[PDB]
Automatic annotation (TrEMBL), chains A, B, C:
Entry-linked PANTHER family: ARGINASE/AGMATINASE (PTHR11358), GUANIDINO ACID HYDROLASE, MITOCHONDRIAL (PTHR11358:SF26)
Sorted UniProt keywords: Hydrolase, Metal-binding
Species name: Trypanosoma cruzi (strain CL Brener)
Any Pfam family: Arginase
Superkingdom, natural source: Eukaryota
Residues bound to Mn(2+) 2: 133, 135, 214, 216
Protein name stated in the entry: Arginase, putative
Annotated binding of Mn(2+) 1, by residue: 109, 133, 137, 214
Entry-linked SUPFAM superfamilies: Arginase/deacetylase (SSF52768)
C-alpha cells in the first residue's frame, strides 16, 4: 500500500503508454574526452532502481501520477554502433510519430545524435534542442556538431545549459555561437536559479523541444557515478526541479539521459538518475 | 591542552551526569523498507569518534560546555528484540525520572518506540514528539504508528520533519494527518530555513518533547553511511544547527539518533553523527 | 584544438616562467593531530591532473591565460625533513627574489613554515599571511606558531580563515589573538560570502601576502581526499572563487596548498586541487 513507479507499468502493449522507456547500453560519449568506460551499464542500473523508487502520489509536490501508463521497450541491440544508432533513431521516431513520449536512458551521450535526427524527422524544420552538460559536445572528429550541421535545424533554437568554462574549449564555444546557438554557463544558471534559467532556455528552444540531460552536468558530491565527473555542477535538487519543469512543459517532446556510469559509482548515482526521471514523470502528469 | 568531548566523561557514577548516553546495537528499522543491514554497528562507530572529537570550549559559537558531565551507560543487551525493547524503555525512563537527559544512539529507528513509551510514562499525557526523517515511520505491520495509537498521546503534538514526498506513501501521510499530526516536508523546511522550521516544530510539540533524529534525513553527499541514503535531504550544517537548537530548548527532554550504518560508509558519517551530538551538547550547556 | 594548463608549460628554462610549481612530498602536518598518512602522495596526484585539466581560454569567466608561462621545478628531495625544509625555503626564496610566483604543492602543512621564512627574507618586515584551514596550526610541540614567534612578523597581518570552532582548542585561539592575529571562523566566512570575506582578509594581510590554502578547510562532500576531512567547510566553488581572487590580487606573492591526500581519496580530490590552482592561474592572468 505504497505504490511506486513500478506500479505505472500497466500498459499491456507499448502503444497504450504515455511514456516509453528505451535503453541504449553503449559507452560512446564522454569516454572519448578522457571519461571512464562503463556508461553502457547505465540502463541496467537505472532499471534496478526504477523498480524500487518513486511514490506515485507525492503529497509534498501534491502531484498524483497514478493515471499515467509507462512502458519499458527494452534495450536497443546491435552488432555495430552504426546499426545501434539507426535502430535507436527509428525507434524514437516511431514513438514520436504516434504522439507518445520517448525517454532514452543511456549509455554515452552519442545517443543524442540519433535522438535528434528522430526529432528532425518527426517535426520537420520545427525542432528545438537543449543540451544540459558540462561540455558543449560539438568538437570535431560528437552528438551536437552533427545536429548543428543539419540543414533543417535552426541553431537559434539550440541551448547549451550549465556548461563549464574550465572544461570547454574556446573553438567549441565559437562553433556554437557562430551557428547562433546559446551558451548558458553554469555560473549564469546559478545566478538566475536553475528552474528560472531553464524556463528561459525553453523560451529559446520553443516548440518540439528535445530535453537532453547529460548527468556529467551534476556536481560529483551528489552524482559521482558518471563518465566525466564534475567538481562543481548542478545539485541533485536542481536536477530534480529541472526535470519536473521539463515534464510539465508541453513543448518538451522527448528526453534522454546520458553518461550514467555505475562502474564509477553504483549505488547513489543510479538513484539520482531514477529520481530525475521520477520528477519528469510527476511534471508530465500535470500536462494539460 | 585541547580538551574535547571525552574530557566531559567525569561523572564517576551515572547519577552524577547531566546527559546519559545509551547504545542500541540492533538493525531493526529502515532495513525493513529496503534499507541496508548494519545500523547495529552504529553505536561502536559513534563511540570511536566520541572519544576523539569536539572542542569543549568552542570560540566560534562562544559556548563553553566544560561544566557538563557526561556518562556512557553502555549498550542495551538482550537475547531477543522484545527484551531489548523492554530494557531500553526501562533504562530511558529511569534517566528521565531522575531528571537527567538520555541520549540514545542506534541502531535502527525501531528504538524510537520504546523511547517514546518511556516519555509517555515519565510525563503522563503531556508529551510531544518530533520525528526528523525522510520517511513517516507509521506504515502498518514502525516506531510512530505505535505512538500515535497511544491513548495518552496527542497527535497535535507530533511533527514529521524533513519528510520527502518521493519516499512517503499517500496512505501514510493520510494516517498522520488523520491523527492530527503535522507534516513539514523537506521543501518547506528549506524554504523556511531549517532552524526556523524546527523552532516552529518545537512550538507544536510543546512541553516534554522527544527529539528523534533519523540520519536518513540527511543528504547522502554529507551523510552517506545510513541505512536508507537520500539524494536530497538536510545538510550537515543544518543538522548541526538543528541539534544546537534542540540542546538549548529547555522543553527537549531526550534525544535519539537512528540509522547510522557504518557498513554503508564508516569514516565520514560517524563523524557527522558525533558532531551532531556535539552541537546538542553545546546547546545544552546554555540551558537556564 | 582545446589547449589546457599543460600547454602553458612553454618556459624552456625556469627563469622564463611567471609561475613556478614546487612539489613537497612529505606527510608532516595534520597527520600529527589524528590525520591520515598519505599527503606525501599529493604532488604526484596533482601533477596527474595538471597535465589533463583546465581550458586556457575560459569563456565563462572571459579570461584568457594563454600568455602565461608555467614551469614545474619538480619535487624537493632530502634525506631528512630538516634538510627538506631548508631546500624548500631556499628554493621558494630564490623564486620570490627574482620576482616570479612560487606555487608549492604539498604535502602536509608543515611546508608552510619554510615557505613563510622565505617570505620574511624576501620582504623584510613587510609580510602578511593568511592560513585557510579548519585548524589554527599554532599548537605547541606547527607551521604558524613558528611564524608568529618571528621577530620580524606582525601578527596584525596574520589571518586564520575558515577555521572551525569544533576543531580548534581555546588555548590556540587565545595564542592567535594574543599575537594580534585575526580569526575568521567558517560561519563568519559563510555569512559574508567567501570571496567578500577573503577580500577583508587581504585588506588585513596587506602587501606581500602569503596565500596558504590547506585543503582540510573544504567540506568532505566536495573534497574527501585530505588528511583531516571536514564535515562542514568551504565548497569547491568557494575554494575556486577564492583562488581566482588571490590570483588577481597583486599583493599575493606566493601560494601553497597542503594536505591533499590521495590515499584517502584519489580521483575527485586531486581534480579539485588542480581546479583550485587553475582558478588561481586565471586570476593571475588578469594582474596589471
Amino acid at each position: 500500500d505504497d505504490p511506486r513507479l513500478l506500479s505505472l507499468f500497466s500498459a499491456q502493449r507499448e502503444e497504450d503508454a504515455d511514456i516509453v522507456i528505451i535503453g541504449f547500453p553503449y559507452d560512446e560519449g564522454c569516454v572519448r574526452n578522457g571519461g571512464r568506460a562503463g556508461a553502457k551499464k547505465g540502463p541496467a542500473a537505472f532499471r534496478f532502481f526504477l523498480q524500487r523508487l518513486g511514490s506515485v502520489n507525492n503529497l509534498e509536490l501534491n502531484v498524483d501520477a497514478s493515471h499515467l501508463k509507462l512502458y519499458d521497450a527494452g534495450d536497443i541491440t546491435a552488432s555495430t554502433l552504426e546499426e545501434a544508432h539507426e535502430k535507436l533513431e527509428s525507434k524514437v521516431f516511431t514513438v514520436l510519430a504516434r504522439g507518445a513520449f520517448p525517454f532514452v536512458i543511456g549509455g554515452g551521450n552519442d545517443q543524442s545524435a540519433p535522438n535528434g535526427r528522430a526529432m528532425l524527422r518527426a517535426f520537420p524544420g520545427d525542432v528545438g534542442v537543449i543540451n544540459v552538460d558540462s561540455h558543449l559536445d560539438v568538437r570535431p572528429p560528437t552528438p551536437f556538431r552533427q545536429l548543428l550541421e543539419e540543414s533543417s535545424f535552426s541553431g537559434k533554437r539550440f541551448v547549451e545549459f550549465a556548461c563549464q568554462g574550465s572544461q570547454c574549449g574556446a573553438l567549441h564555444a565559437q562553433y556554437v555561437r557562430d551557428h547562433q546557438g546559446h551558451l548558458m554557463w553554469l555560473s549564469e544558471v546559478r545566478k538566475k536559479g536553475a528552474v528560472a534559467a531553464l524556463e528561459d532556455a525553453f523560451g529559446l528552444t520553443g516548440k518540439n523541444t528535445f530535453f537532453s540531460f547529460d548527468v556529467d552536468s551534476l556536481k560529483s558530491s551528489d552524482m559521482p557515478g558518471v563518465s566525466c565527473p564534475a567538481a562543481v555542477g548542478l545539485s541533485a535538487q536542481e536536477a530534480f526541479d529541472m526535470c519536473f519543469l521539463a515534464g510539465k512543459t508541453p513543448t518538451v517532446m522527448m528526453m534522454d539521459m546520458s553518461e550514467l556510469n555505475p562502474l564509477v559509482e553504483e549505488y547513489r548515482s543510479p538513484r539520482v538518475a531514477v529520481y530525475m526521471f521520477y520528477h519528469f514523470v510527476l511534471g508530465f502528469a500535470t500536462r494539460p
